[PDB]
Design a protein around this nucleic acid. Structure first.
Ligand SMILES: [Mg+2]
Lengths: 86, 1362
RNA sequence: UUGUAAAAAAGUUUUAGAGCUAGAAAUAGCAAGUUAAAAUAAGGCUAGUCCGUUAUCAACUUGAAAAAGUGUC
């Protein structure tokens, strides 16, 4: 597939500031993507059953979801990332 | 009450700090707190429990790489300026606006102050120049080879191109076969390989590697052709994969090194350098030279392929080769068009015009990479006839290449210097100033600031240390006579030394220190045992034997193996026949590598063994670690010119070393044991019966080492102490917040200090979660089952994902047999069988596989309360041995199984379990404890002994995690953030209860110097002995339980009220005190605070975007209108600012009043902070009310109607501000229901738990009503809640476990923070964003202190008026 | 286990590499492409071949800044 550090690398290559947070044993780990640098932030947190990379792919494989116009580009960029992992 | 004594609990993490105050009865107090501000609220009662949340602290690395990129651009820029300085006066006589035209070449024609054609100034000469010189390499070859006088502008352009793009500095001196040729670099690779595998060398005698590796075949073909010449070597062996790495392929080194997870490597990947670091982490730093030598050869092959070298000799081989590539590109392009035009003419448009496709137009004009272009045309070539040649070129990666391209980093600067120098010699007679500056101009290209000099500062750089010996501008030409090289290097060494943790004020040694490496061999050598014919027990190595081994094996070879040990030494020096070795596996990991490097170079075995010269050699290694500047190495070795020949002197400098170790020379061979006068290394050599290593010798409290280490660690300010920690920058941030919480809580509690501070610290870097360990599980079985010669994996297929079932793992680990009876288990009936603890729960809570076995019935262990019976041990020992030799059980697990042979569990065993339970092994937690302790305990008594008013206590998280599962105080992190606070409370409970029951155990878990009690003396010899002897059943958390069940089903009852017998104090009332704990965990008012911060870092997204007439783009320079030039998008808001002012609403210029929220970008910040009203006035606003300008950083908190809260993510987006306090009863239901299967416990209650979830299926509907009433009130995502409410209906009849698992997903609708997508079964809920901040401007802004106990509430609706 | 020094190759952006034939245009047909300059955080004053993305930050009082205070018998 691809792992969490691959995914972070790919998102950064699309010119998005992205942070992995919560990597304590105490906190739930969360991928946070700064979509626009103005408060829009796309958060994928890890579940016990399903992982961040799994959630990312199932969320962005079919491209944009038409919800917010200021995110159409962001969904296209994330979709191309899904294709990469084959 | 009246009691004022209290204790503090803490849960330090990298994104959170939980804290709690407790009283002697484990209650959390409640106090009224003054509420400041302008509202009607003047006080609230708050519970003293909560948690601070914060963004991760970040490393200085990203900042550093951006800093070094800037210095590189600045200095490249300056090389060009130096050249132009040299050219200016003569260029002026030739073309007086030429340098002007290049300076302004970027401007649109409207803005150019000169004529738009840079080189010549008119269209005719420019068009002709380009036809004559289609690439800069045609100009370079012509200028290198011709003897004509040339135009001074063309001479400039060729020099500038070599000086601006001057190539690499990886090779020192002139190029020659040994630093540049494929054959020589190949030899070095096999020499390096044969150095690490003496037993199985590569013999490459006839092997023409230059021809095989430099040929014009694909990469995989050259790998085959090379390996075909090495009988014994598979293509994917270690050497083959090294050659594959050298050729640009991506070998997988996993199977080479018998790793669990694969280790793919590719030298060109941006990730390569730490992909290699992660490989070397596993296999050993010893292999670093191997991958380095593979890397050097890689460069020599790439450069070989770039220089199509031949005997049409030029002085311009590189330009010549690029011209050839230009022409070949042209021919193949012409043919490609023809073949397409003939066979696929409908694809012509796409391939050559459509630059959004990855064909030729995308390749030249549309950003497509070479790799992408090849992937696009290859199917098309394969469709056409006459494409065989082109496809060969493609699969060789040599089709239609450009000249500026990714290979070029393997071009040494010495090549550009070659052409640069030739050109000057051609023209220096037609232009005397070129002759007079020839060496000045070549210096510009070759000079390089040495590492050890650093930035050439003059007072105003925090990174600089360089030292002048003349106050004048340093240039490439005056450097050696202006820079004080000696003093700068001295300062370099000081700054670059790390000090010994164990004993500060002592520098650490190089990682390749001969002492470090002697130390490391003797520390491995001291745990090695043996047996031979006629011996009672497995004996240790006599120091006289260790000394003889290091002299005949380690000082003669690089790797010593159990074979040459058992054969070359035992059976050839000690007259043995067959010696069992039992401390060392295949070979020795440590080595005297440096000894052999110096033996090979210096060729003087006596010199090296004379432990009189050991300072000379260590200083040599020291110099080759600190330095790479051969000129500075020459100066620092000048003293030993008498000692060594110019042949070995030369070879020394060319040998490099990198790396530091952890220890100082004084630690290893400095401090001496008082009574013995033995240094540490002195002990590793001789020690008699007991053969201790290093970690023992430090830990050993019977010697003087541990005491002096402590006496050593002695350390001013607070941020000093925190910078000085071995820790990630995230944890240091969390530590500093933790200190601030403790201070604030002290204030809250009347400035009275606590009785105890209990600390627990999270483990970092638990990133991967779930798969990594499950391949290890498969790795262990495959090696072990094979080691047994078992047919169990053919009879029963292998799949590493059901290896996470612990019963199935143990089944395979035990070769499919009962661990307690010589019988077989049924793999299909594992549900009938019991997992059993070797050491029972009553002595220790060890639930790892190390302590578990699978038996058809746990009654097969025997009838003891102990380890399994003597009978089992006599019957099964020989089967356990096989499992041990095959690594299917650890040694430790073998000793526990067989313990009944040695009497069972001794007091010594129990004393160790007790240490294992209390003692926190991590160094970082000890330094946190020392900071807190140094802060709280400041006073000294009448005898100058520190008065420890506050006891700071460190708990292993396992104690509280086990407490939670034992007494069903379950935690579900997804519900809300309370669990951080609850953890701190629970630490306070357990730590303070522990310190009451077990005062004599203080030294094990309270910071400071206490009486150290022989714990053995506290252990009762029998249960009847129960007097002042604490433990029979070694599990220290037993006093919380009311009954404990022993390993034979017997039940031991304890009193309801537990007391310390020695001191009379009550420590736990099982009625009262559990209810206290439950009552605390169910309190809905917990102070959860998210720390507010200004945003720092980059101004914006980094893409340099094409021009738009969108005014949203940010210009890259002051006068570059992005409507003409492009620029940047999406700036970053440092903070938002509340602005009340007037604006104009029309042509009348009449003033409407406004109250707005303005984001200040990081870029705008200084401007705004210098003249805020001038800044605001220039943005529109007038009549600004300066006294109401409120800085609103990220996460600023607001409260609206009905306790609904929002946090500020920026000036134009909000985050959720509320926490959903689900009642404690629903929490444990969710945990039990969603773990209904994976339950872990006694069937007697694991069945009782399952009936609890069955009889509370109605909690499902109650929890949903909780979610729904919270959401209608504060989430305000109506459509979303309608969707989840129906989705809960569509599945009301799915199993309880399944509905509970999905109800947990539902809490991301309600979580604090940014709204996030989630699922409920198949239904997907899209996040409802809060894209309007308007409502916040009439709400209550809540300033919070770090605990949230102290607040100022500002009602913003009172602003906007007078 | 942090922190730091030296260098290189790409990439991007704007400009320069006179596009041609036919046509009243719209447009169609073709030719062509591989290179270069310059910027690469806006910039700053201390003007260095220096510095500019880490750390640090509730509110309020006092300080230049470490830091010290304010809510509590
Ligand atoms: Mg600059």
């Amino acid at each position: 597939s691809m792992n969490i550090n691959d995914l972070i690398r790919e998102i950064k290559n699309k010119d998005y500031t992205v942070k992995l947070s919560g990597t304590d044993s105490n906190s739930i780990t969360q991928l946070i993507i700064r979509v626009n640098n103005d408060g829009n932030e796309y958060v994928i947190s890890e579940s016990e059953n399903e992982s961040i990379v799994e959630k990312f792919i199932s969320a962005f494989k079919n491209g944009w979801n038409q919800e917010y116009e200021d995110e159409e580009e962001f969904y296209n960029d994330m979709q191309t990332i899904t294709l990469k992992s084959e | 009450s009246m009691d004022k004594k209290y204790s503090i609990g803490l849960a330090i993490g990298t994104n959170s700090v939980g804290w709690a105050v407790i009283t002697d009865e484990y209650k959390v107090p409640s106090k009224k707190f003054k509420v400041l501000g302008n509202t009607d609220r003047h006080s609230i009662k708050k519970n003293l429990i909560g948690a601070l949340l914060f963004d991760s602290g970040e490393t200085a690395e990203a900042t550093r790489l951006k800093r070094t990129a800037r210095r590189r651009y600045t200095r490249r820029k300056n090389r060009i300026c130096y050249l132009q300085e040299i050219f200016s006066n003569e260029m002026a006589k030739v073309d007086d606006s030429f340098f002007h035209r290049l300076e302004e070449s970027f401007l649109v024609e409207e803005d150019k102050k000169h004529e738009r054609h840079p080189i010549f100034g008119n269209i005719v000469d420019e068009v002709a120049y380009h036809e004559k010189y289609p690439t800069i390499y045609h100009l370079r070859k012509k200028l290198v080879d011709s003897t004509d006088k040339a135009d001074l502008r063309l001479i400039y352009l060729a020099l500038a191109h070599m000086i601006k793009f001057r190539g690499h500095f990886l090779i020192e001196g002139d190029l020659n076969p040994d630093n540049s040729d494929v054959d020589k670099l190949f030899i070095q690779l096999v020499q390096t390989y044969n150095q690490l595998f003496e037993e199985n060398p590569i013999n490459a005698s006839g092997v023409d590697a230059k021809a095989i590796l430099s040929a014009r075949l694909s990469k995989s073909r050259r790998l085959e052709n090379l390996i075909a010449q090495l009988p014994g070597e598979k293509k994917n062996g270690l050497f083959g994969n090294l050659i594959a790495l050298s050729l640009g392929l991506t070998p997988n080194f996993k199977s080479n090194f018998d790793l669990a997870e694969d280790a793919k490597l590719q030298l060109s990947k941006d990730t390569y350098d730490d992909d290699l670091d992660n490989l070397l982490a596993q296999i050993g730093d010893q292999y670093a030279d191997l991958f380095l030598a593979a890397k050097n050869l890689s460069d020599a092959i790439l450069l070989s392929d770039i220089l199509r070298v031949n005997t049409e000799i030029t002085k311009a081989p590189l330009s010549a080769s690029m011209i050839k590539r230009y022409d070949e590109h042209h021919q193949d392009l012409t043919l490609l068009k023809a073949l397409v035009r003939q066979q696929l003419p409908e694809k012509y448009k796409e391939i050559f015009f459509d630059q959004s496709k990855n064909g030729y137009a995308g390749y030249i004009d549309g950003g497509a990479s070479q790799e992408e272009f090849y992937k696009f045309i290859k199917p098309i070539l394969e469709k056409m006839d006459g494409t065989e040649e082109l496809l060969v070129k493609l699969n060789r990666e040599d089709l239609l290449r450009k000249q500026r391209t990714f290979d070029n980093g393997s071009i040494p600067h010495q090549i550009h210097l070659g052409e640069l120098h030739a050109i000057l010699r051609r023209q220096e007679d037609f232009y005397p100033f070129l002759k007079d500056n020839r060496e000045k101009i070549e210096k510009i290209l070759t000079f390089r600031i040495p590492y050890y000099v650093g930035p050439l500062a003059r007072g105003n750089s925090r990174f600089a240390w360089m030292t002048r010996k003349s106050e004048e501008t340093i240039t490439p030409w005056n450097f050696e006579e202006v820079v004080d090289k000696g003093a700068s290097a001295q300062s370099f060494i000081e700054r670059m030394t790390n000090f010994d943790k164990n004993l500060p004020n002592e520098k650490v040694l190089p990682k390749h220190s001969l002492l470090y490496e002697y130390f490391t061999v003797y520390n491995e050598l001291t745990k090695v045992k043996y047996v031979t014919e006629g011996m009672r027990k497995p004996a240790f190595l006599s120091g006289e034997q260790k000394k003889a081994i290091v002299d005949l094996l380690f000082k003669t070879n690089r790797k010593v193996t159990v074979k040459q040990l058992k054969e070359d030494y035992f059976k050839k020096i000690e007259c043995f026949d067959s010696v069992e070795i039992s401390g060392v596996e295949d070979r020795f990991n440590a080595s005297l590598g440096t000894y052999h490097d110096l033996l090979k170079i210096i060729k003087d075995k006596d010199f090296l063994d004379n432990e009189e010269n050991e300072d000379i050699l260590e200083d040599i290694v020291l110099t080759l670690t600190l330095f790479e500047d051969r000129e500075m190495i020459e100066e620092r070795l000048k003293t030993y010119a008498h000692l060594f020949d110019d042949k070995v002197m030369k070879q020394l400098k060319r040998r490099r070393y990198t790396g530091w170790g952890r220890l100082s020379r004084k630690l290893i061979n400095g401090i001496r044991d008082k009574q013995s006068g033995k240094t540490i290394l002195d002990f590793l050599k001789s020690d008699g019966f007991a053969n201790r290593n290093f970690m023992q010798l430090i830990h050993d409290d019977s010697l003087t080492f541990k005491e002096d280490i402590q006496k050593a660690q002695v350390s001013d300010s607070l941020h000093e102490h925190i910078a000085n920690l071995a820790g990630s920058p995230a944890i240091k941030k969390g530590i500093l917040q933790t200190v601030k919480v403790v201070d604030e809580l002290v204030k809250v509690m009347g400035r009275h200090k606590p009785e105890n501070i209990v600390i627990e610290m999270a483990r970092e870097n638990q990133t991967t979660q779930k798969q990594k360990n499950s391949r290890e599980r498969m790795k262990r079985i495959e090696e072990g089952i094979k080691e047994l010669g078992s047919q169990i994996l053919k009879e029963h297929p292998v799949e590493n994902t059901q290896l996470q079932n612990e019963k199935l793992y143990l089944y395979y680990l035990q070769n499919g047999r009962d661990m307690y009876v010589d019988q077989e288990l049924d793999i299909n009936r594992l549900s009938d069988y019991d997992v059993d603890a070797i050491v029972p729960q009553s002595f220790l809570k060890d639930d790892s596989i190390d302590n578990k076995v699978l038996t058809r019935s746990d009654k097969n262990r025997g009838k003891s309360d102990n380890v399994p019976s003597e009978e089992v041990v006599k019957k099964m020992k020989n089967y356990w041995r096989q499992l041990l030799n095959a690594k299917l059980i650890t040694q430790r697990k073998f000793d526990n199984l067989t313990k009944a042979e040695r009497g069972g569990l001794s007091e010594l065993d129990k004393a160790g379990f007790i240490k294992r339970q209390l003692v926190e092994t991590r160094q970082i937690t000890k330094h946190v404890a020392q900071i807190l302790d140094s802060r709280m305990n400041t006073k000294y008594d009448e005898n100058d002994k520190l008065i420890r008013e506050v006891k700071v206590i460190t708990l292993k998280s396992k104690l509280v995690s086990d407490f939670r599962k034992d007494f069903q105080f379950y935690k579900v992190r997804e519900i809300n953030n309370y669990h951080h606070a609850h953890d701190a409370y629970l630490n306070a409970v357990v730590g303070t209860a522990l310190i009451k029951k077990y005062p004599k155990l203080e030294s094990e878990f309270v910071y400071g110097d206490y009486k150290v009690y022989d714990v053995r003396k506290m252990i009762a010899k029998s249960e009847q002995e129960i007097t002042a002897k604490y433990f029979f059943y070694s599990n220290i958390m037993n006093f919380f339980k009311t009954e404990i069940t022993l390993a034979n089903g017997e039940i031991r009852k304890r009193p309801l009220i537990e007391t310390n017998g020695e001191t009379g104090e009550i420590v736990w009332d099982k009625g009262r005190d559990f209810a206290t704990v439950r009552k605390v965990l169910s309190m809905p008012q917990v102070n959860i605070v998210k720390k507010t911060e200004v945003q720092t870092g980059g101004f914006s997204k980094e893409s340099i975007l094409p021009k738009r007439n969108s005014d949203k783009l940010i210009a890259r320079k002051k006068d570059w209108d992005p409507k003409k030039y492009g620029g940047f998008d999406s700036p970053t808001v440092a903070y938002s600012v509340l602005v009340v002012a007037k604006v104009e609403k029309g042509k009348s210029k009449k003033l409407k009043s406004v109250k707005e929220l303005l984001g200040i970008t990081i870029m705008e910040r200084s401007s705004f902070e210098k003249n805020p009203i001038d800044f605001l006035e220039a943005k529109g606003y007038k009549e600004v009310k300066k006294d109401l300008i409120i800085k609103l950083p990220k996460y600023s908190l607001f409260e609206l109607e009905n306790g609904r809260k929002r946090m500020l993510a920026s000036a134009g987006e909000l985050q959720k501000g509320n926490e959903l306090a689900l009642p404690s009863k629903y929490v444990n239901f969710l945990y039990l229901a969603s773990h209904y299967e994976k339950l872990k416990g006694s069937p007697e209650d694991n069945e009782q738990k399952q009936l609890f979830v069955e009889q509370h299926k109605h909690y499902l509907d109650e929890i949903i009503e909780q979610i729904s009433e919270f959401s209608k009130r504060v989430i305000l995502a109506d459509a979303n809640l309608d969707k989840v409410l129906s989705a809960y209906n569509k599945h009301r009849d799915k199993p309880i476990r399944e509905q509970a698992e999905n109800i947990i997903h539902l809490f991301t609708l309600t979580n604090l923070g940014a709204p996030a997508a989630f699922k409920y079964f198949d239904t997907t809920i899209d996040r409802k964003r809060y894209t309007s901040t308007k409502e916040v401007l009439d709400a209550t802004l809540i300033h919070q202190s770090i605990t949230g106990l102290y607040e100022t509430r500002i009602d913003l609706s009172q602003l906007g008026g007078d």
